[PDB]
Amino acid sequence: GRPASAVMQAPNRAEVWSRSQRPRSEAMAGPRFEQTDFDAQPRPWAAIELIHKQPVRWTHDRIVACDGGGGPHGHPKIYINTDKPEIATCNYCGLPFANEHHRKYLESLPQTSYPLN
Amino acid sequence: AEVELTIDGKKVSIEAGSALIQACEKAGVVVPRYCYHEKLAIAGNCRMCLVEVERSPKPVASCAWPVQAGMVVKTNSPLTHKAREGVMEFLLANHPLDCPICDQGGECDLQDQSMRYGADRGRFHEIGGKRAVEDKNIGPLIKTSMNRCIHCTRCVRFMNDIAGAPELGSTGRGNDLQIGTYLEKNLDSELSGNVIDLCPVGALTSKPYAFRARPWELKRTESIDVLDGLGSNIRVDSRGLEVMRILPRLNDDVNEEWINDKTRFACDGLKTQRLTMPLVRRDGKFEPATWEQALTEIAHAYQTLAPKENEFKVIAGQLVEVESLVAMKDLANRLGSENLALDFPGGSQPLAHGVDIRSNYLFNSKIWGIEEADAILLVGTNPRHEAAVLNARIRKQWLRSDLEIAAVGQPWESTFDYEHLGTDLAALKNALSGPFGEKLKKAKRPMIIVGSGVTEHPDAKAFYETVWSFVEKNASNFLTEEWCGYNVLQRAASRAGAFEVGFVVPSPEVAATKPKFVWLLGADEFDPADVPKDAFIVYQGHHGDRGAEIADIVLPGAAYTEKAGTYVNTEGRVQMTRAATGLPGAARTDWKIIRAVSEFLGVPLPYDDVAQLRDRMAEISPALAAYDVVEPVALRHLSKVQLVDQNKGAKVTGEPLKKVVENFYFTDVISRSSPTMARCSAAKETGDPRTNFMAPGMEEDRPMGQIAYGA
Amino acid sequence: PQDGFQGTRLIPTGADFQSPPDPFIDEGARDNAANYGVQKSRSGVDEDSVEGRKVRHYTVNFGPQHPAAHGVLRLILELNGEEIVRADPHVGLLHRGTEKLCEYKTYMQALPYFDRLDYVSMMTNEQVFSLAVEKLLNIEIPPRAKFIRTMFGEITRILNHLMSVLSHAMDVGALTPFLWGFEEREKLMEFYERVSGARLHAAYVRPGGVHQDIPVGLLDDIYQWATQFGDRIDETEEMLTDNRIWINRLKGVGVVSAADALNLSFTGVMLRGSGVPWDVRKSSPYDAYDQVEFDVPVGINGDCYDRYLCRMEEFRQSLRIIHQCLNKMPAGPVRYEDYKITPPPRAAMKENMEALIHHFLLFTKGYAVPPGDTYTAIEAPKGEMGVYVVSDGSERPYRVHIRAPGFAHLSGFDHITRGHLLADAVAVIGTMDLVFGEVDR
Amino acid sequence: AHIEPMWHAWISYQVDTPPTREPLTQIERPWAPKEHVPNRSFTRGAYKPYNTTQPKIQSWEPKAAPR
Amino acid sequence: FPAAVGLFGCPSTVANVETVSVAPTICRRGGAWFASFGRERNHGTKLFCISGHVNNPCTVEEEMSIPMRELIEKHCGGVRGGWDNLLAVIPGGSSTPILPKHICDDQLMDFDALKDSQSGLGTAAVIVMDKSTDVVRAISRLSHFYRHESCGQCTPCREGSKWTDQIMKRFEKGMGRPREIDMLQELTKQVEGHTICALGEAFAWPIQGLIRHFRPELEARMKKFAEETGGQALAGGWTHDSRQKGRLVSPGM
Ligand code: SF4
Ligand code: SF4
Ligand code: SF4
Ligand code: FES
Ligand SMILES: [Zn+2]
Known part of the structure; x- marks a missing residue:
């Protein structure tokens, strides 16, 4: 677990996004990972970060x-x-919708889940 | 009398005043249904049970049509084909296209009756779209997806009639009629999770179970619940190593298709704080041990201590099965001990009711006897927090009949109405000498129910003689050819079975001998005064909890979802579990552990197999070989001796009866380790009706969500 | 059952009901030249029952690792010099328990198994299973599916015969026709890989029609191939039919009589070579066969040469059928229009509720087949291929038994080969056209 | 395996329009490999499989309370 | 049945105000007196709220089995703009099927007589419509009224009153193909006798009667919308080019 490509769960997100997801640092360890190129390993982007942009x-x-x-x-x-x-x-896809009747309320929240604009 | 009709050409008899749908299940004729449930009131709303009947201009709702003298019924005609196809078109027109993301898929009545009774294709394509409604927060247990609702009314009937929780309803009108609570409030009922299974569709689903399993990949095991004393019949659904969910299964004599939430939603505590290896306390730390170097360390300690008669003590917990108690009674007996305690307070001394006659400590009128009960007296028990699905049966009999209930003890929020007569023995004495005693006297099928909290009380000696004296005074009402008015209600699965084989302190002479070697056989709610500080403590069990953390050596045993153990419920029904999974890690079967140490201690036990021990079991009490049945107490009247003759001069203190269940969600090791019960308790403490209260999901104050469940 | 514990009446046996021949008209001690002193016990002094159990003929394991074995056959040959006295074919070396695995599958899930029995004739194997389930389903597949299944049924027949006839010529020593004909089959697997996504195991023909519709350029490309395939048949006809080494390697070899060929469970060319006019597509028309004209090649001497001439004629008859299918291809669906049986279009499944429920149930539970049993048989390129399917009324078959033509043919190997030389055994393996995916199953 | 994905279809006669003129090669995907990712077998960049899920049963962390 | 178990579970009977408001007079004047009006099986007087395109809307008490035209042309001043301007009448309230001008000419305002017209006397409300009416709009408004006035207890009327409303809102503007008119006919007949109460009939009957006498009007504006959008509409109201513009269109829509 030397490089960041063997610790960060995804290039776009460091921590796990499920209750049961085994951390990358806990699965890149062991004898099977002793002469291995970490950045050559499949390391796909986390969809949880992407959908929320x-x-x-x-x-x-x-x-x-x-x-x-x-x-x-x-x-x-x-x-x-x-x-x-x-x-x-x-x-199905996570796309965010809001009703304009709450535009004033949502643009008042200290944080939100999706970009309001 | 059974009237005679013909359904689909075949003749069927059935009691008059039955539904025509009921005559169909007798005639082996399948009729589609959504709103109709055998255990609920008839609603007539879905229109899927329409059949053809002679002299009838229009199709009749078979669920709501009273069977007539000589009717002729067609369930397979062009009229019925046309109706079932057309009603399926209506129920599927605003239904969401969410069969891939729904947890009811593969176990859906709407897809199974759409495939069998509807057209293969939809004709609904409107540019206006389907109806969409907003989701609702009804607590931490029931995930909502209300677009799926087909307006069957099964959960509102269950919540209002069966469970006595009149918070759920259907506000609105027309196509905008919506099931839910008006105000966003938690559902507070121990029978709550039963609406998940009642729900024909997946609008009302399980939060802990959401998205984890599909039904076709689940192994189904028919077992027994051990989380209370009723022995509810359950179906354990496993996917390989892991239990996934606990479902009720039909037993009208015991649980009536219902389980409570703790029985249901505590299974996630079967995977969390488990014991998988022997641990020997060394220098104040718990270190792993091999099974050999743990039994040797036990044997060495016993040899060093040289315990005489009754300095070996055994305490058994709520979840222990009879193959362990019969094996532990045989181990202690050959070590010279008759000191066989119980986990409750007062479980280490002789009990107010003895164990000579089974009718002393059972629910003698059956659980099915409440179906006839006319007068019920409650003595020191909250039937909601002790036997939740038995509490519902009392309400069911109460709504449909002239049943009168009074209680002695702590007042409780109840699903039925009752009269509070008092809190202590003086109040109970006036209760029987007063109007409710005359109500108990004058009634057919009278019923006194003693809770196990009384047996825990200072005055159980005096309480138990007072009640039985009333019973013996009033036989031919209480003790008839077919009735037993005397009941003792058990709230732990192990306790009637413990009484069945004598696993109980026989005399205060035994109870006054301080032990130096204490085995805690699944015991975790033991009083701190029943365990000596300097005794060598051995803990056997499946969870690391209060019992394991004070012991010198721990031995990992099996849980009830991984053993085939006998349990006797509060009425004396003998039931067996079935292992859903194998043993974790290096855990053993408990009766094998006890048999294994009998080798090391110098007194091996004759049996080497479960059949040999179940032969031993059947000659302690032969009822233990008759499974699924309750044996009748032959000498019923011999209950006077231990109940009255042995309980005459009691130093009555007057201390009022207690509330022995402080927290319903935490009652044993499995519940205390369940994340789901931890959310139930915390939501109940603050009232958060939100579904994602300590669970994954986005919230307004939680923009990013969380992976944590139970925190 | 219980009575069998002690001695009771003996169960009658074929030896008991033997009858003595009439001596007035009986002529000869052997009306068959198969048993005319070309087997065991034609040499030596004593029989191999007593005092002969201590000696062996020259016994050679012909296969499995052998070219003429064409795969995975262990043919134990007993040679008297270079002559075969006894042939014991040992099979089961490609037995993989297909018929037991089918019992833990839905009916859809079992269809790819049939691709892998006669694994040069995938779409024909698919058809016999699709026609048995459709019969137990009591449904009528649409006309376009029936014409696609007959056209790809004969494209499959040509593909099998290219592998069969030219593998057989390769064994006898002719190398070049094998190479030419494998460009044609390489051409025809494009038609597979264009309608399905596989060159070999299409999984195309399914109970209810075919999986997808043919793409919009396929019929024109099949016709373009068809305009030149006659020349391909003629140039392989040009190296073997009159070749005097081809004629003397096959004429008079592997001879089976008409009355013995039926008694041996022979079908297809193995039967039609002996002079019997029999075609399953003529006698029990299935799919669109009763809507087309084709001739049936029938031999007269029942030898390897007549069987070769019948198969080279079926090239020309298959190409003749294919042309009529291209001409008579109707419009309409390629799947039975019932979503309770066949999967709905992806468009409908994403658009409508009853289409989604049916898509979900057909891919998890499967469809239920009404209870019963059936024997269904088709004219496979290697003979009568049949299936015996028993139905529970549930979504998994209770029993799937495959009747493989080559299983019935390899069993009659010792009957027709004992007395020929070692090269003649090679000749008879190829004329009998074995694929051990179907033999072993 | 050194042929880029869209061109793998063109060399295979699976399309006739080359990736120069093909619109689907214009959908911006920030998560797409910027570099060339070939078959990595027989090298130390060879893919190593693993469990993506946590263990199914959690054992007690022993806590020996003082005597 | 209320005669056994009704209000509060007690024996009960529901009756209309007019039914009860005449019964004392039925006694003080006589059964023979009241049975002196109407036809053989239909007797007595009736009130008649006659709204719509009349030049003088009013209620009137008049003899049952009166011809409708004389009821309209004498008590209410006749059809607005004359009788020829009439197109259609609803002879009961909104729950009875529509009647075209050609059958209104000799229609008795009678319980049995309106039944032979495939309609009902209903509440003897008489809504008349001129030749300047959008009749599908008038019917579709009623289909919208019943969508709002359904209780929502049973599957056929909770789903069918909203489904029929969306079809009717489409049919006004011609967003649909003619074979859907038959599809809407089938839908109403799957509601008609499959419900807890007669409100399912109350929203299915007005639609059916419109199909029965005004389908060419429904067909005329389906054709017009096709030429307006350059293609026959798909089922559900989608345009012919929906698949071309990358919409989701199932086979057969
Ligand atoms: S309840 Fe769920 S599984 Fe059943 S039809 Fe509706 S969305 Fe599909
Ligand atoms: S939530 Fe479920 S049980 Fe309740 S009305 Fe809706 S479908 Fe019926
Ligand atoms: S028919 Fe009656 S019960 Fe049914 S939805 Fe309409 S108003 Fe409600
Ligand atoms: S089952 Fe009779 S109407 Fe719902
Ligand atoms: Zn989406």
Whole structure:
């Protein structure tokens, strides 16, 4: 566990993002890792950090439709209620929605989950 | 009388005033349903049970139609095909396309009855879209996804009728009718997790179980709950090494398709603080030991101490099974000890009720006897926190009949109505001499229920003679050809079975002999005065808790999801667990540990196998060889001797009865190690109705979430 | 069962019901030239039952690591000099328990197993399993699927015969036709890899039709190949049919009579070589065969040469059928239009609720097949390929038994080969067209 | 295995439009490998597999309370 | 049934105000007196709230089995702009199927008579419509009324009153193809006798009667929308080019 490519869980995020995720430092150790190039190992980006750099899709309708934007390529079409003063998230892809009726409340919170703008 | 009708051409008889759907399960005729449940009131809402009936212009809801004299019913006609196809189209029109992300997939009535009774394709494509509703916070246990709701009303009927929790409802009207609480409030009911299984769809799911398993990859084991004294029949779902969830299974004599939340949601404590290796205390530290160098270290200590009669002491806990107590009774007996204690307070002295006649310490009117009960007296027990699904049966009988309940002891928030008669023996004496005694006298099927808290009390000697004297005075009401009014309620799974084989302190002469070698057989709630400071302590069990941390040597045993152990419930039903998983690490079976040390100590026990020990068991009491049944106490009236003749002059103190369950979520080692119960207690302390209270998930004050569950 | 514990009535046996031949008309002690002094016990002094159990003929393990073994056969040969006195084929060296593994699969999950039985004839093996499940499902697959399955059924037949006939010529010593014909099969696996995603194990033909529809350029490219495949048949015809070394290696070799070929469970060319007119696609038409014209090659001498002439004719008849399928290809679905059986289109599964529920249940539980059993047989390129499927009424088959043509053929090896030379055994392995994925299963 | 992914389809006659003129080679993915990632077998950069999940059962950390 | 178990679980009977408001007069004047009006199986007087495109809306008490035109043309002053301007009438309240001008001419305002018109007397509310009405808009408004007035207890009316409303809101503006008209006909007949109460009939019947006499109007504006968007609409209201613009369109939509 000498390099950062053998400790950081992902290049974009250092810590684990699941209850059960074995830390990289705890899985790059052992005899099987003694003559190994760490940066040559598969080290993919954490999707938990990426999805949360998306900005909120603002809408006035009570109910929004998300199908993943790909048409048949995306995901099954669903509908998200936006009534709670909170950013509503698509359960398949994580895209954030908010209703403009909470624009003043959300732009008052000390922090949030997604970029409001 | 059973009237006679024909369903699908075949003849069926059934009691009048039955639902027509009920006549179908008798005639072996499958009828689709969503709102109808056998254990709930009929609702008539889904429209999936419509069948054809003669002289009837329109299809009839089979769940709500009373069986008539000579009706002819068609469940397979073009009328029924057209109705089931059309109603499926309606229930699937605003249903969310979330079958991949839903935890009900592979175990869904809506997909199994859509595949069997609906068209293969939807005709709903509206540009307006489907209905979407917002999610709800009803506590730390029940994850909500309310787009999935099909408005069956099963959880509102369960919460209001079965559980006595009238906080859940359906606010709104039309297509915007929404199940939930109006105010965002926690659901406070020990029977809460039962709405997860009742829910036809996955709108009301389990927070601890969310996204972890699918049902087709689960092994199903039919076992017994040991987390209380009822012996609820459970289904243990395992994926290899790990238990995933605990489900109820049908036993109308015991649990009636319900389990409580602690029985349900404490399984996650089976993987967290386990004992997998022998530990010997060396220089104030616990170091690992080989099994040989732990049994040798035990044997050396016993040889050095040279314990005479009754300086060997054994205390057994809530979760111990009978193959261990019968094995431990045979080990201590050949070591010269008859000092066989119990984990509760007052468990190291002779008990107020003895163990000579089984009717002294059982629930003699069955659990099924409450189904007929007309008058019930409660003596020092909170039936909610002791036997939660038995508490519901009392409410069920109460709503549908003229059942009168009174109680003596600490007042409790109850799902049924009752009269508080007092808190101590003086109040109980007036209770029987007063109106409720006459109510107990005048009634058919009268029922006095003594909780195990009384047996723990200073005046159990005096309480138990007072009650039995009332019973013996009032036989032909209490002691009839078919009725037993006397009941003692046990809240631990091991205790009736302990009484079954005599694992109890026989005399104060034994109880007054200070031990120097104490075996804690799964004991963790032991009183600090029952364990000498200078005694050599041996702890056997499966969790590192209060018992293990004061011992000199720990021996890792099995848990109940990994042993085939006999348990006797509060009424004397003899049930066996089935191992769902193997033993962790280097743990052993408990009766093998006891048999193994009998080699080292110099007195090996004859049996070398479970059958040989179950032959030993069946000649301590032959009922232990008759599984799933309750034996009748032949000499019922012999209960007078230990209850009255042996309990006559008692130094009554007048101290009121106590509340023996302070925290429902923490009652044993498994519960005290469960992260899910830790969230139940903490949410109940502060009232946070939020689903992600100490769990993964995003919140307003938690923008980034957390991986921690239970913290 | 219980009565068998002690002695009871003996179960009757074929030896008991033996009957004596009539002496007035009986002529000859051997009406068959297969047993005419070309087996064991034709030499020596005493029989090999007593005082002969101490000696062996020259015994050689012909395979498994052998070219003429074509794979994984252990053919134990007893040679009298260079002559075969007894042939004991030992199989099970590619037995992998396919028929037991099918019982822990859904019906969809078991279909790729059939790709790997006769593993030069994948789409034909798929068809016999797809036609047995469709019969137990009581469904009628659409016309476009039936024409795709017959066209790829004959593309598969040509692929098998290229491997079969030219492997057989390679064993006899002719190398060049093998190389030419493997460019044609290399051409035809593009058609596989264009409709499925595999050159060999397509998993294409499934109960209910075919997995996907053919791509929009495929029929034109199949027709372009078809306009030149006749010349390919003629140039391999040009090196073997009249070759005098080819004729004297196969004519009079591996001779089986018509009445013995039926009694030996022979099917296909092994049967049609003996003069019997029998084709499963003529006698029990399946898919689109009863909608096309083709001839049935039948030999008259029942030898390796007639079997070679019948197979080289089936090249021309398969190419003739393929042309009619290209011409008669209808429009419409390629999957039975019931989503309770066949998976819905991905568009529909992402758009509509009943399509998603059906997609979810078909890939986890599978579809349920109504209870019963069936024997279904098709004209596979190697003979009558059959399957016996027993159905529980659940989503997993209770029993899947494969009737493999080459299992029935390798069993009659000692019957037709004993008395020929070691090279003639090589000739008979290739004419009998064995693939041990189907033999062992 | 030294051929870049889009060109691997062009050399295989799986597409006719070359990655110069192909729009899908323009979707910006900051998480995509910036460098060339070939088959790494027979080198010390060879992929080593591992458990991505935590252990399933946690043992007690012994705490011997003072006598 | 309330006659056994009704209010508070007690024996009960529900009856209309007009039903109860005549019964004392039925006694003080006589059963024969009241049974002197209407047809053979239909007797007595009736109130008639006659709203809509009349030149003088009003309620009136008039004899049952009266021809509707004379009821309209005499008590209420007749159809606005004359009788020829009439297009259609709802002879009961919003829960009875529509009646075109050609059958209104000799229709008795009667319990049995309106039944033969495949309609009902209903509450004897009479909503008349001129030849300047958007009839599908008038019907679709009722389909919107029933979406808001459904209790939500049972599957067919909680899902079918919203589904039918969205179809009707599409059919006003022609976003759909004609074979959907049959699909909407089937939907109403899967509600019609599959419900706890007659509100399922109350929102299915007005739609069915509209299909019964105004399908060419439904067809005319489906055709118009197709030429307006350059293509026949898909099922659900999507445009013909939805798949071209990268939308999600199942086979057969
Ligand atoms: S409840 Fe869940 S699994 Fe069942 S149909 Fe609905 S989304 Fe699918
Ligand atoms: S939450 Fe579940 S149980 Fe309650 S009404 Fe909805 S579907 Fe029925
Ligand atoms: S038909 Fe009646 S019960 Fe059903 S949703 Fe409509 S108003 Fe409610
Ligand atoms: S089951 Fe009878 S209507 Fe729901
Ligand atoms: Zn999405």
